Subunit: 176 residues, 4 copies
């Protein structure tokens, strides 16, 4: 409950659709469930993914990467997850220490660009990995999986779900 609220608020302000991350985790767990001979669990998980994805298009809109360049199919790609990619040499120098101090202050005060620039110029690189989900295609995949599960076609449902996981596109973007 607490975690769910905390993650939703944080993700909302990061423009990340945690609801999509959760649908994909349901999918992941469904495939696991199948191969543990837990088809009832797999149904509950796939039905939950369906329910999450069924949130209306207007609600997904603020999370859509409208300028997404690498699409596997013509769809609206939603930023469903993201993470920090970071590189430095891990050797302390006074220039780096000063740069970190400056960047910390700038982050505390909301000067994101100044923080990132300051770190960059000191040899500390930081960007965002993004995970992009095709909204209508993933909806389709989950529905197809539901039907296969109803038919007892577990292995086949597992592969449709794998397909849905393989449709998540990885991208990188600068933080600003």
């Amino acid at each position: 409950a607490a975690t769910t609220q905390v993650q939703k608020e944080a993700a909302d302000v990061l423009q990340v659709a945690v609801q999509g991350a959760n649908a994909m985790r349901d999918i992941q767990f469904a495939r696991l469930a199948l191969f543990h001979g837990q088809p009832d669990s797999a149904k509950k998980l796939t039905d939950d993914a369906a329910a999450l994805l069924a949130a209306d298009d207007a609600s997904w809109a603020k999370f859509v990467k409208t300028d997404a360049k690498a699409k596997m199919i013509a769809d609206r790609y939603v930023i469903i997850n993201a993470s920090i990619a970071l590189s430095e040499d891990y050797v302390a120098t006074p220039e780096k220490e000063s740069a970190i101090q400056s960047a910390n202050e700038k982050l505390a005060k909301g000067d994101q660009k100044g923080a990132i620039d300051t770190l960059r110029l000191a040899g500390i690189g930081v960007i965002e990995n993004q995970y992009l989900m095709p909204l209508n295609q993933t909806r389709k995949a989950v529905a197809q999986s539901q039907e296969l599960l109803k038919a007892g076609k577990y292995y086949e449902a597992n592969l449709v779900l794998k397909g849905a996981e393989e449709g998540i596109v990885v991208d990188s973007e600068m933080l600003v």
Copy 2:
């Protein structure tokens, strides 16, 4: 009802989704810091600390007893897992029959029979597992909390990065 559905499913899969959630809190905290959202980073790291503070008895259900590799002397919890699958994707009657047989076996909860049947037909299926050192992740999160309080955001980010790097990847057969 996602929280409930995931908990019930993960409990019977011997996966500590509470651990996965703590790790996602950590992941989001690092993001938050670099978007100039220190109050959010605090909320997220405090939530990670709360989840991790669950008692040792509750974590024990999910502790891996056969881990061949550990970085630190600690209890490693299976906090996440996923299916690793390999086949040739060329349909044959022999494979299709094996699949039908496996499906029948899974319907009745016969995991071993299902996995053996698929393996004999050239369809491989095992588990990837993600292992979290319990006390070391507790320690890293507390350390990060203190650094955030001190305004040492970049440093807290690296402590959290180390916590993420402490997740050990493993594989195991489904049987």
Copy 3:
């Protein structure tokens, strides 16, 4: 008689026509193995591997230029990012249908004739998605990291050299692009 192994030549010729600088992938694998070697108590192997990375990266800028992603949008530092590795990302539902069977045959015939766009579009319309994952290496920063690691190794600072090399690996940016 089957082709004899000629891996360096085969990869180079193939990667050149794919706009992938396999020389960069080779430099990064050297780096990877150097870190492994350090933690096996093999400093000499680590030196040889890091020196090899340095030699590969020292290839002149003109030679790297055709592999630079000049429109790279996610950069950690201001640098020339080289496409050093790439792989196929593929998604389909694995359910055969007549429409997919026909589309796959058609795509195969198009690829036979080098009609990449037609093939990818045909697969796409049948629900078969295919794009490229790319691995982008900052040329000057990686040169710098490798040189720095060489100096640390000379000083016997093996753990530190390991972390510099780790940072070099962490400098590799992951991107995706449509195949056409």
Copy 4:
């Protein structure tokens, strides 16, 4: 002068002492590039790469033996799983302290003498974790998948060959191991 590149030799000699079959890594990179080539409408290149993989994998069973993980626990199929690639997994907090600095110096001294165990223990007890991620390739099954792909390519079944190769790649099992 600086060491000129001799990448295949340097990688082989290092991997041999590390018990990593780089020949396997090379075959898998050939397979990866072959899939890439197919989707660029380069079937001739895909053939050369797949043929090179076949040639590398055709190395005799005796030669693969020193790299077989005899006690592999997570097999997809009954096969000899070869350690074909490995990398360092490392975790620390990146906060310098006198205790960690001392431990790092001590670890470096121990690694200088080839004392892997002492070094790794020393780091571990200072809160620096270091293990190996290993990549395990089923030898017979991978040979089989490459031959099968070769036939499909001869038949112009490019998409299908791609998926057989994808399955070969999905047959690589990832494990972790203690350095020592």
